Design a protein around this ligand. Structure first.
Ligand SMILES: [Ca+2]
Ligand SMILES: [Ca+2]
Ligand SMILES: [Ca+2]
Ligand SMILES: [Ca+2]
Lengths: 167, 21, 167, 21
């Protein structure tokens, strides 16, 4: 846990708590997509959380090997529970960037929104959000454009930022 | 604490949709 | 919204988003305990969230007048969504201090835990937590003792801190 | 983001109960 402590916002005792919990509740030593889906389907039982769970699982699976090891699980938790707003937004951008190419296109945003609406149990609004986010009008939202609009003081962007914070 | 906040997701979604003409 | 902006972590445009949302979804201009219970019963449908909702409502109702005005709603959200860990812990202490006397006794902690377990759908563990938290052994947990143990590096306290963060 | 975190409440509760002898 020494290296993990040095790489995350957790002390060794916090990592021992997470580790013990991880070894008990998840014996294979990794979190598979099936587990993510179960965790979210339990919590959002009155909707279909499978797609969102899928994107979320891919967000945790940084190596894209289909297996979230303890190290990956803690790294994500470190950011989500204790990272700066800057780190949290970057983690979120990477969640929306489905195919992990470093860009978010309108379809991808559309898929993310539908996955969220499916979880909570549309198009028009997204075309409005995407247009405001794609600053240079070239059909792709880069990390820099994402950071800017998701921290800018514009009523529409503020609305979206609030939803994302609660999300 | 996150669970307490998360419960306001419907309100959040409604607040955002309220500004999308 | 000028004074509110000066008193919270929200800019005027963020407050306008919250305000518009508040005027639509909650026409009386205040949030009554019945609304809090409905909001939480919706989100946690497979359990009884009424008691927790009750303590939470009392936490928002700082004036203890039985009515959460927009100002009170935003003040709480400011802390929960953007306050420092110090401010968030103080808000939380006040949530657990059911009778608002500035002290948390074992019964109160017991009630809070049961309300949470009821929401998620016991005694022994709480007697262990309370004992570790009441530093001077006088049967009451003050804000200072709460802050200390909920920021200290002890495996049991770390376990509890994690649960509270996720809670 | 809070909703995503909140879903891990069962795990959190289990992790805490795992240290209470
Ligand atoms: Ca992409
Ligand atoms: Ca662009
Ligand atoms: Ca008290
Ligand atoms: Ca004491």
């Amino acid at each position: 846990l020494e290296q993990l402590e040095a790489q995350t916002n957790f002390t060794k005792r916090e990592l021992q708590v997470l580790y013990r919990g991880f070894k008990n509740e998840c014996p294979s030593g990794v979190v598979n997509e099936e587990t993510f889906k179960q965790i979210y389907a339990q919590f959002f039982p009155h909707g279909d959380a499978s797609t969102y769970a899928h994107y979320l699982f891919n967000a945790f699976d940084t190596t894209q090997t289909g297996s979230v090891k303890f190290e990956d699980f803690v790294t994500a938790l470190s950011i989500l529970l204790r990272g700066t707003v800057h780190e949290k937004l970057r983690w979120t951008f990477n969640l929306y960037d489905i195919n992990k190419d470093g860009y978010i296109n309108k379809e991808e945003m559309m898929d993310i929104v539908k996955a969220i609406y499916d979880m909570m149990g549309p198009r028009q609004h997204v075309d409005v959000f995407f247009q405001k986010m794609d600053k240079n009008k070239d059909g792709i939202v880069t990390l820099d454009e994402f950071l800017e609009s998701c921290q800018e003081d514009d009523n529409i962007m503020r609305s979206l930022q609030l939803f994302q914070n609660v999300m | 604490m996150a669970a307490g906040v998360a419960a306001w997701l419907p309100f959040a979604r409604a607040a955002a949709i309220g500004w999308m003409p």
